[PDB]
Amino acid sequence: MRESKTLGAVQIMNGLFHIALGGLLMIPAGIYAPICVTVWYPLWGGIMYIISGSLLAATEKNSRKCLVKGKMIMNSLSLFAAISGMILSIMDILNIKISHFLKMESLNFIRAHTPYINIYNCEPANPSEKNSPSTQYCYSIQSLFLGILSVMLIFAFFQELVIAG
Amino acid sequence: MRESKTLGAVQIMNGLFHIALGGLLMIPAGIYAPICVTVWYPLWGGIMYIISGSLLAATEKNSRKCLVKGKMIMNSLSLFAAISGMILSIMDILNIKISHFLKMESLNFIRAHTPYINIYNCEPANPSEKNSPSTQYCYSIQSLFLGILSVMLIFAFFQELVIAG
């Protein structure tokens, strides 16, 4: 029992950090964006993770219990976000590093800032360029995207370990 | 009182997020690195934030409280870490956007991967290049660094609001 208030607190913090990383990942970076962003996963995931903080309401055993049983359904929906989010992140991390299993068109107001760029292929057509600074930028950006996605993966996984009765 | 167990839980989550963003920010990205990374702040801050979770101990009032009084010093030093961490981030965010108030040499094994890059000046000497993709690459990297630092700023600030408790 008394762990439950603490667990709720942890769940809420874990929900805010998804909003943070999801926003940061959406900064313009080419015509193609990671699947999870085109799915808008970080926003719904975070929102559901917070609502599932309902156990912060504590055990109001007044009358028939005021943690209303519909809340168990409420708890139950949030588990659906943890699995699907983990699978999405582990899919995107593959699209960056072997080949496009999928491609997604980003969003139009994002494209307005990086229309001539991709990050999923990164090697120049002209071999004279293989040491040009222009190429070192592209590998650095790939490494940042792999980083952000791997941190999302681990903190998302940290829900599934606990968001269950 | 009964807020305190919760506050401790929140403090621990907030501590792990600093380890995460600190590692991500240290990915090779040029000869100059943000002051906070060269100060090595993201590690010590997070560590002291977790240690200051010592209020995670139950309030054992056994004749005199088992929260040994030295822990109050522990809590206080962690508040010093919170203030200093905030100031460092709001300094770094200025060095990106007007000019170098300071420059710091990064670390040698970082430079081994981005020896010909700087993110602090980003404009081509050759005006024919002002629409070359290489410039859009550089501005995108600046925007990612501003993002990471601003998220660090706001989550660090979220200690000082409460670690005084």
């Epitope: 015509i31 229309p115 001539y116 991709n118 292929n121 090697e123 120049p124 057509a125 002209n126 071999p127 004279s128 293989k130 | 024919s128 290049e129 629409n131 070359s132 993709p133």
Partner: antibody
Framework: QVQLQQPGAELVKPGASVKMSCKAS????????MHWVKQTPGRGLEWIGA????????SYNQKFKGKATLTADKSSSTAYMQLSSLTSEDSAVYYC??????????????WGAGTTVTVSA | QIVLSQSPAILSASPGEKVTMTCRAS?????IHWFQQKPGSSPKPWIY???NLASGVPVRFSGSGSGTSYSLTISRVEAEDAATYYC?????????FGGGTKLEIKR
């Protein structure tokens, strides 16, 4: 003045291999990238790959990465392409081309006369 | 890899007409380059960087466009203008050529 020279045609037995050459003249050979292009009446123009004779770095289109192999003689000013395991699909015209950075973008400013390959038993 | 679509497939005009032909890319590109080929020769470079005429190209030609949409235009076609025109891009790997446009003479 600048020119690229190629032999006119090749006859090859099926399944054998063929090697064909593009020779440069009139410029500093080691200072520019050399590019290869394939034309057919059914699929237009396709780009095979390139070599930088200044050091031997190469790049390939994945669709051809198993077929071709590019090499250069830094002394004799001659580029070679080798094709292996030829089939009826390969009968096409092959060009070398020189590319230069000009006016803010690359462009193919000089082209060879082209070589015709026929695959037939 | 991005694909360039050209239209029309066959373009038809009388001497002294104005004519235009268009290339549309599936994604926005920095520049389009245009080439001319006739049967039995290598392609020739014709327009580079969207709007700069190559050496010796007659002033009848001009080029224009931006973003995803580009055009090439001929002010007064002449009997020597009969050829096939390919558009080309270098914005991404690999560089790609369009499907070509063939120019006829009306009679």
């Amino acid at each position: 003045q600048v020119q690229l020279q190629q032999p006119g045609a090749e006859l090859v037995k099926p399944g054998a291999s063929v090697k064909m050459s593009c020779k440069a003249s009139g410029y500093t050979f080691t200072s520019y990238n050399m590019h290869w292009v394939k034309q057919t009446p059914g699929r237009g123009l396709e780009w095979i790959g390139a070599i930088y004779p200044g050091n031997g770095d190469t790049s390939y289109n994945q669709k051809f990465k198993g077929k071709a192999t590019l090499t250069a003689d830094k002394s004799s000013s001659t580029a070679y392409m080798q094709l292996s395991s030829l089939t009826s699909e390969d009968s096409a015209v092959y060009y070398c081309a020189r590319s230069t950075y000009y006016g803010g973008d690359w462009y193919f400013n000089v082209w060879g006369a082209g070589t015709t390959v026929t695959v037939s038993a | 890899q991005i694909v360039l679509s050209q239209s029309p497939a066959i373009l038809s005009a009388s001497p002294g007409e104005k004519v235009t032909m268009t290339c549309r890319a599936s994604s926005s590109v920095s520049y389009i380059h245009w080439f001319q080929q006739k049967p039995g020769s290598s392609p020739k470079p014709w327009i580079y960087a969207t709007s700069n005429l190559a050496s010796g190209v007659p002033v009848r030609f001009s080029g224009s466009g931006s973003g995803t949409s580009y055009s090439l235009t001929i002010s007064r076609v002449e009997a020597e203008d009969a050829a096939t025109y390919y558009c080309q891009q270098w914005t991404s790997n690999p560089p790609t050529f369009g499907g070509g446009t063939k120019l006829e003479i009306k009679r």
